[PDB]
Amino acid sequence: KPMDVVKLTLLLSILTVAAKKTLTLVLDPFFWMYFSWTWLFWPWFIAVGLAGYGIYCFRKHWLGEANAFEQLGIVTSVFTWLTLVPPAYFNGYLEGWPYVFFLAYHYFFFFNVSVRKRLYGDFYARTHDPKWDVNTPLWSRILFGVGIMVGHWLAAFEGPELHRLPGGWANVGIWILIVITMLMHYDSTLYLARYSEKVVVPTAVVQFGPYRWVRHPIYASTMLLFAAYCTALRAPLSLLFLLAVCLVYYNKKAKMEEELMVESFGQSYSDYADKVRHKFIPFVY
Amino acid sequence: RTSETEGTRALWISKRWWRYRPKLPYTYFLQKLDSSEVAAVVFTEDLK
Amino acid sequence: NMEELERKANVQLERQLVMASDWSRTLLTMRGKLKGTEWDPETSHRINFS
Secondary structure (H helix, E strand, C coil): HHHHHHHEEEEEEHHHHHHHHHHHHHHHHHHHHHHHCCCCHHHHHHHHHHHHHHHHHHHHHCCCCCCCHHHHHHHHHHHHHHHHHHHHHHCCCCCCCHHHHHHHHHHCCCCCCHHHHHCCCCCCCCCCCCCCCCCCCHHHHHHHHHHHHHHHHHHHHHHCCCCCCCCCCCCHHHHHHHHHHHHHHHHHHHHHHCCEEECCCECCCCHHHHHHHHHHHHHHHHHHHHHHHHHCCCCCCHHHHHHHHHHHHHHHHHHHHHHHHHHHHHHHHHHHHHCCCCCCCCCCC | CCCCCCCCCCCHHHHCCCCCCCCCCCCHHHHHCCCCCCCCCCCCCCCC | HHHHHHHHHHHHHHHHHHHHHHHHHHHCCCCCCCCCCCCCCCCCCCCCCC
8 A cells, every 4th residue: 555655654764863863862972971971870860760660559559450569669669768768868878777777677578478478378368357457547547657757857867977876886786676676576477367367357365475565566566666777877856756656646546456356355355455554665655 | 278178088989889980081180180170189009 | 250150161161071072082982983093003013122
């Protein structure tokens, strides 16, 4: 057909123009002087370009079509954008504790995956009653996330520069806090997930290990992770502010969950809560 | 000379290892240093 | 103010020119156009100290 030949000529012309534009961009030494003028911020090409991928995958998961890599990228976007970006923004050099806490946060959140895969077939959601899982208003969830961001940026702002913070025998307490946090959280998770038949359907009342010290141990362990984090860059003020905001939201969800399982269980969790009154921190609250 | 930059020249290299530096000529460096436009000269240990 | 900004723009132009010449050299050498020239010469007989 003649129109096919005409369109082939047009495609050849526009491809010639595009290839010529690309070639005269490349072999021009001045575009090489100006486009290699942006390599100084090759650290800042990645840390923001990945955020668009993270939010795009977040929207895709909100629709309901997310592979494992995209959800991993969602939590990675949150966690990296939390830990590494603010001190890199404030001092321009990242060396030391922010790296290892970026590792530690991912090592922390990949703990429901292993427990819910070992004693299970795969990561697919199962069928259960709708009333079992406690929900909480969306504005409060967004407020929790925003407060966590605010406290982390304020922690990086408040803390001294990464070379002024001491080492030696003062960095050994930080390791102690890290290890005790991950022990308590893993014990709490292993004790909670052992007694549930479905994904979250508790058959009985758990009162073992971290449950005989604190009624809500996973929550306390998570906050203690942020407390050790605010101790790492030496910013106690942010530690106190996350104490306030995390305590407020997390106590709200704890009250909702507790009233649900007191209604659904009765005297057992009643005498258990009589045994351990201290709800989040040992004999502080 | 009471500049607060007493020894803040090499640890900059050590910290911002992940930056980029392009190549500069020699006789340009000599002619540029003769007119005193350089306030920092940081050597490599092996004179290369 | 305009004098100081003029000096700033002029030294900017100088540095732009010298890295532009650097990129021009390292680009034009790779197409064989600088072959036989001083920047990309050819091997010949050696030379002694004297």
